[PDB]
Amino acid sequence: QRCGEQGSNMECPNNLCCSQYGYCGMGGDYCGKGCQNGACWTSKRCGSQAGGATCTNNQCCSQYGYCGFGAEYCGAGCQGGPCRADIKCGSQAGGKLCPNNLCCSQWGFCGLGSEFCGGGCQSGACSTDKPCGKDAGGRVCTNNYCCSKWGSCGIGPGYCGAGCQSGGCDG
Amino acid sequence: QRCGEQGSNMECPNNLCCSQYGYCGMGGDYCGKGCQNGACWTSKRCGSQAGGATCTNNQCCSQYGYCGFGAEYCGAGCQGGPCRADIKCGSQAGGKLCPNNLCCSQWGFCGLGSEFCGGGCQSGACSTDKPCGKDAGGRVCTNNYCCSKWGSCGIGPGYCGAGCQSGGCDG
Amino acid sequence: DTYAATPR
Numbered sequence: 001q002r003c004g005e006q007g008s009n010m011e012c013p014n015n016l017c018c019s020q021y022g023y024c025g026m027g028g029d030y031c032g033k034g035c036q037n038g039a040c041w042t043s044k045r046c047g048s049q050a051g052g053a054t055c056t057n058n059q060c061c062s063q064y065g066y067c068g069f070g071a072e073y074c075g076a077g078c079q080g081g082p083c084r085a086d087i088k089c090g091s092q093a094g095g096k097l098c099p100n101n102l103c104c105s106q107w108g109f110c111g112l113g114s115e116f117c118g119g120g121c122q123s124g125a126c127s128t129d130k131p132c133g134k135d136a137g138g139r140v141c142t143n144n145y146c147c148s149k150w151g152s153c154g155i156g157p158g159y160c161g162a163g164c165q166s167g168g169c170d171g
Numbered sequence: 172q173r174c175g176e177q178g179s180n181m182e183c184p185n186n187l188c189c190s191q192y193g194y195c196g197m198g199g200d201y202c203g204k205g206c207q208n209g210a211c212w213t214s215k216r217c218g219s220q221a222g223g224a225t226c227t228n229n230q231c232c233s234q235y236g237y238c239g240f241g242a243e244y245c246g247a248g249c250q251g252g253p254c255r256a257d258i259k260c261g262s263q264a265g266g267k268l269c270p271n272n273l274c275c276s277q278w279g280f281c282g283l284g285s286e287f288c289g290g291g292c293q294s295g296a297c298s299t300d301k302p303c304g305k306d307a308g309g310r311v312c313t314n315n316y317c318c319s320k321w322g323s324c325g326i327g328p329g330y331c332g333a334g335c336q337s338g339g340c341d342g
Numbered sequence: 343d344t345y346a347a348t349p350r
Binding site for chain 2 (some may be wrong): 003008009010015025036041056057081082087110111114116124127148152156
């Protein structure tokens with residue numbers, strides 16, 4: 001029920017503003033001073049300008065390094081988030097990965113949905129759930145997900161915890 | 172702490188799936204069956220096909236009424252989220268509201284950021300904080316936001332509670 | 343593009 005730092009960086013629904021206090025709402029108390037995510041009155045910084053930082057809430061990072069939506073952000077120059085240009089990846093783009101866990105399709109484009117995540121998906125949130133590590137010949141994971149104890153890719157206590165075969169383990 | 176139904180529709184950072192248990196992570200335990208938001212393996216329905224329901228995580232609602240990112244979801248016939256087309260609103264669209272609290276700019280386009288939410292913002296999360304209520308000749312807020320006892324528009328207990336003047340006041 | 347049952 002908490003958002004931002006107080007709620008493990010959780011984001012509010014429907015672009016509600018996460019106040020300084022870790023509560024979702026709308027109006028000055030939430031979006032004004034200290035707003036952590038959502039439609040903050042002051043746009044958070046991103047992309048080169050903030051040295052590669054992502055925008056919260058799938059916002060577009062403009063050519064000037066500001067977070068938002070609309071042509072100004074998502075259009076010409078967009079540096080991240082759901083940009084209007086088609087985003088290339090995988091084998092077709094020198095092995096690049098999609099930002100924010102997007103699935104790299106069999107064709108080499110970044111998205112979400114079964115066309116991207118389904119059979120052939122190369123990296124990110126694939127729905128294919130292909131085995132990793134030991135019982136699958138030292139096969140890591142894309143994105144540095146953790147290869148559980150079952151040679152299963154993911155993130156969370158169960159993949160990064162104890163028995164963690166590869167990637168981003170918890171120690 | 173929790174996301175989804177368990178955490179007031181709280182969403183996970185970076186497209187992580189919210190499992191049926193209200194926790195954020197990645198893999199088939201979070202994204203598989205019962206996933207609530209983020210990169211779910213089963214895309215939610217939206218738009219006309221699902222009687223106006225909007226996607227979580229600012230995903231695009233395709234022409235076919237499925238949530239996702241990429242050209243098939245945000246391109247032609249996109250019905251919501253950060254569509255590739257400039258989305259019309261406000262006067263320039265007969266008073267229509269932008270979805271998900273987005274700002275309606277002065278020129279009648281939906282977005283987030285100064286250029287949309289600042290000076291001339293018509294509806295949504297404007298940051299101009301124009302006064303409402305008794306002291307502002309009884310103007311009501313757009314979007315059914317609450318007019319607090321002090322003449323400010325927002326959503327939260329300070330706005331919708333004790334002394335709320337108009338909008339979705341608590342009762 | 344297929345998997346999971348979509349109504350039609």
